[PDB]
Subunit: 307 residues, 5 copies
């Protein structure tokens, strides 16, 4: 095979779309292999700029195509340089821009700890014809800085693995596995905006929903709970635009569920308190000891749910 050395530079990571679970990564790729010795004008290496490499490719120069596996849509490439040394090595430098995708598990939404994965693999040549020697990822632009609400932490993990493509084994009998480079960049979500915009207001809504039992008569406490339910409904919408449709529940969706549960349990308890009287003579105070018991049970529920 041909020993190909890659040096991926990351310019910036931007536009991390949580709803679509995609992100956009800019930067440069510098692939370098070796070939036969060639003659250049002077001792200096030749610079082959874009839209003119095609004359060299139609001349017979071996320029492989390196594609991104996990990309969404066509990667919007820009300028490209094919720098030709006369000692033998050929260097393909290109700028890439594309939307990449990952799994992006969302069990803990505001306190999330995710990673951004770049995958590179030759489109046509397998590991018997093109082998990745090593990659050095230069994430010095975003090594210790925060993009949007994501704090990039650590360096970039590099890994070279041989992926196997069983769909291509009908045209290649034995050699049908490809050398893939994986680049992993960790990212920790900053939870401050969610903390002061969704979590603590909903805690205040929960305390206000607890405040129904301090009232004195029945219609006023029903109307208190109804306008409280209105608030919880409105809040549920606010969360929609912050995270996609998930089979599980996150922290904020669990808080919405707890708000609905608290308010409707209060309404049902108030109804059962009102219809407690068989002949309309009994006072209703024995069941209304939930001024100091219902918040305690709610705190126990929250403490269990945190762990």
């Amino acid at each position: 095979p041909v020993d190909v050395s890659v040096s991926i530079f990351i310019n910036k990571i931007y536009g991390v779309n949580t709803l679509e679970q995609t992100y956009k990564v800019d930067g440069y790729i510098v692939a370098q292999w070796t070939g036969k010795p060639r003659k250049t004008p002077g001792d200096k290496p030749l610079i082959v700029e874009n839209t003119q490499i095609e004359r060299w490719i139609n001349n017979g120069l071996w320029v492989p195509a390196l594609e991104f596996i996990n990309v969404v849509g066509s990667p919007d490439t820009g300028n490209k340089r094919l720098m030709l040394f006369p000692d033998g090595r050929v260097i393909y430098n290109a700028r890439f821009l594309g939307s990449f995708s990952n799994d992006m598990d969302f069990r803990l939404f505001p306190f999330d700890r995710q990673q951004f994965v770049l995958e590179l693999e030759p489109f046509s040549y397998n590991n018997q014809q093109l082998r990745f020697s090593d990659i050095q990822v230069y994430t010095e632009n975003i090594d210790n800085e925060e993009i949007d609400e994501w704090w990039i932490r650590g360096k970039a993990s590099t890994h070279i693995s041989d992926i196997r493509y069983d769909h291509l084994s009908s045209v290649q009998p034995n050699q049908n596995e490809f050398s893939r480079i994986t680049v992993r960049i960790d990212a920790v979500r900053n939870p401050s905006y969610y903390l002061w915009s969704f979590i603590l207001p909903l805690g205040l809504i929960i305390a206000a929903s607890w405040s129904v039992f301090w009232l004195e008569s029945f219609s006023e406490r029903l109307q208190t709970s109804f306008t409280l339910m209105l608030t919880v409904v409105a809040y549920a919408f606010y969360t929609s635009n912050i995270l996609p449709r998930l089979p599980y529940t996150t922290v904020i969706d669990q808080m919405i569920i707890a708000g609905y549960g608290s308010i409707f349990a209060a309404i049902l308890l108030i109804i059962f308190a009102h219809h407690r009287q068989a002949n309309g003579v009994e006072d209703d105070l024995l069941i209304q000891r939930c001024r100091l018991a219902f918040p305690l049970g709610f705190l126990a529920i929250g403490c269990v749910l945190v762990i």
Copy 2:
């Protein structure tokens, strides 16, 4: 005709847009036919990368164009390889990315069970000049995994059928039918998010709407029902962004309809209870036996509506 063998690899299915009834499918296509024996440099097969196939096509090589019938917009193709063996066969490998469309029947919205259809057909050569022998679809990347809220279940159904184009019979007298490949991938929607975000909150709203009859006087129970109607209105909006405009009603839209019906039937019943008095002396308890009859009728309605 020419026997063409296709091997479609599916990389990932993403972005299933329910409102537009489209979805995006990435992956590779490997078409393979046979031709005259040719000579290559060495015994090894020749690899013809992208943007250089045109020299071979202008030289006179037969490379058919395979289009997607059910695609929405232009399919955003990427890299392509035209691998030439010297024993005779020509292999056209290409990467595709495009938005596909299907019927996507939506009778049961959250408990839906849909399929994703890929259709492939030659644009110009009919079955008398190009015949699809067989297709093996390698859906091993998403065989037993869930994309977004869709759990992909089973393998990919393959079918080769001869579709007939009557619009082209004016230029082709007898042979005007084309061989189309259909690839069917089943998908079952995960109903959990809808279950805890729309169905059970609306059930709590229904119980709260039932709670009007436990009040004691008239203006308070009218205001109770009015703020309850407000909630149902708000909920109706939340559903809009989850499913398109349909002639029929789904489960959630039927729940909104049942909420409106319950609240307005309660308001009309309360009004008729108030105006039951001919001279203002009669008590109103005979018509207010709906504390234990109106929910029973609603449960009967729901049980009939489920089946």
Copy 3:
């Protein structure tokens, strides 16, 4: 002139955007004219696939360009075949995809009855150099089926007319008129979703707004009407995302107007009832005979407004 025969095939009509008054039409166009006899390899006709027609065009073959007049944006063309018979005729087959536009009058919004218009006209050759003989439109894919909320009814109307371009008369003295093909596909909007989502809920809101006069005192009936107005406001928004900004009023906007009018007329009547007392001794029942007169006038208003 040259007699050109067109056979437009319609694959699917999708994405009818009411707010933008555009729609997207896929399918194929098959133009066919006649020319000098030519020699082909063998007796079989020659197939000229895409991205290779340019060699024949630079060789000197007459391939006219047919553009779409009413299109919005560039029509996203795909594959194209230039099928050359040796008996003389040249057949240009191409696939088109583009957003088309029409007037789309919206007097009756949910019970609308619209049409989809495709217009085709040569860009450069007038009727003295290129004449459309006839068109057969093959709308067999959507002849008797419903797209989105639009039920396609009937076949496709064909018409050939000579349009006149006065802007081009400075460069062409007498012959400056072009032969345009118009294809009309009727479509009837399915009113069910609007009927059970906007019309009947707003009727329930109207009845609830009528329900104010059954109350007994003043502050409660003012608050009843205020929360009712809140509902009407919310509903007005829901309609915004369903139809564009229009100088006139549709059915649903007239229902919103009637809701505002009913509620504010009720508020003004209640205020005038309260201030009817010169010395605070008169009872207010003479002006509150609108329990059985205000709905009757509203029904008369609605019956007049329907016709």
Copy 4:
């Protein structure tokens, strides 16, 4: 210089985006200059269709590039004809489609009276090498018709002016000014939809906010004003999606401001009426003469604000 005559045809103006202050204009451009006499096949003029003009341009034909100065993004050109007469003149006909921009002053929002400006200027040749003789704009398609909510009024104003580019004076010593064509199309916004959707409902909200002073006690009138403020808040949002962020206030934003001012002045006046009692014995009627004075002052404010 070379005398260039332009004849701009306007097909349709659509998609006037008020928030972005852009609009989309379709149509054709017909540029015509004169040159050396040439020989054509026969006496007829030659038609040079698109994607084949490049052979004539590489042959040495002078085809200038005319760009649009005020365009947003790349103007999506379509088909183009380079019609060559043998008597000497060369005619460049092209179809354009692009998003144009203007200042679009918005002092009176619903009763606005705007214009749509098209600017054309050669990219490379100044007025010493290419001079625009005259332009005739053929706006006969939209001369007396209304697009969206904009009624196009009058014809299209034509003007040829020499614009000066000081950035290019480092490479051109004296001749660095360019001949620009400006095309002005007036448009009057139809105010009906805003009149019955925002202005008159907000007037009803204003009258309902005036209705607080007719109540009898304090808590009910505070709650009346609070639910009224809720309505005004909701209305403020509805306006957001109709006009961009502006330093000044339009009519509708002034109505929102007047609604907030009326309601909060009523709340402050009610509070000062309640705390008017030094010992709780005084009646509060002297300050509540605003049943017939507060609307009069509001009418004076509105009459001053209109002029």
Copy 5:
């Protein structure tokens, strides 16, 4: 190296997207270097228009590619002129259009004072082979005018710095640093729209929330505070569409936080006032001296928070 002189002209800055922290800059770039003397037809300089420069580039002319570092997506270039003087200098004039990005710190949101940064750097040639001599930025189109809600103030700051690329040092031993031009355009946000749309309405909401303590009994003051909280919730949403997710709090988000704090502190104080009675005989006036103390503390909080 080669001395390259740049003269950037700015046509217009538009579409400053605060949520994405990007902006769009149109205009022209005029690069100029020197080379060997050449012969042109006549004494006049040669004009090389677009899509024909490639013949000169394949002939062997040195045209460097200048890229934008901070751009988002591919910069949508338009027409380009390569003006060749016979005295030796080569002038590359091109039009650019692209979305640029900056840090855009948002500590004070409505009273913001930002800058727009354009960065230009050769893609392939380092400072040993191409050196930027000087840049004159001609921002005369927007020198003293306001774009959208941004008032452009001052001229454009020019700076030439040598940036160092450590990722490219594996292919270049010592010379691996590039000359970058930075263009800084200051912009001050106009705070009027936010001042009369968010700040003063929320101040009125704060005063209305203070108004709870003037009521007389308990259930009415709880319901007053609940409908007030509803308003604050609604307002929080309005702000979402005006600024992105930030770790810190701006002015308007601090006002939302203060509204929630004031209302929930009022609710807690009212609850503690109600449960102040050990046996139900004590009057509650000592803790309700916050009619003239709670606003004073709120004013102290606001005065501290401003500085």
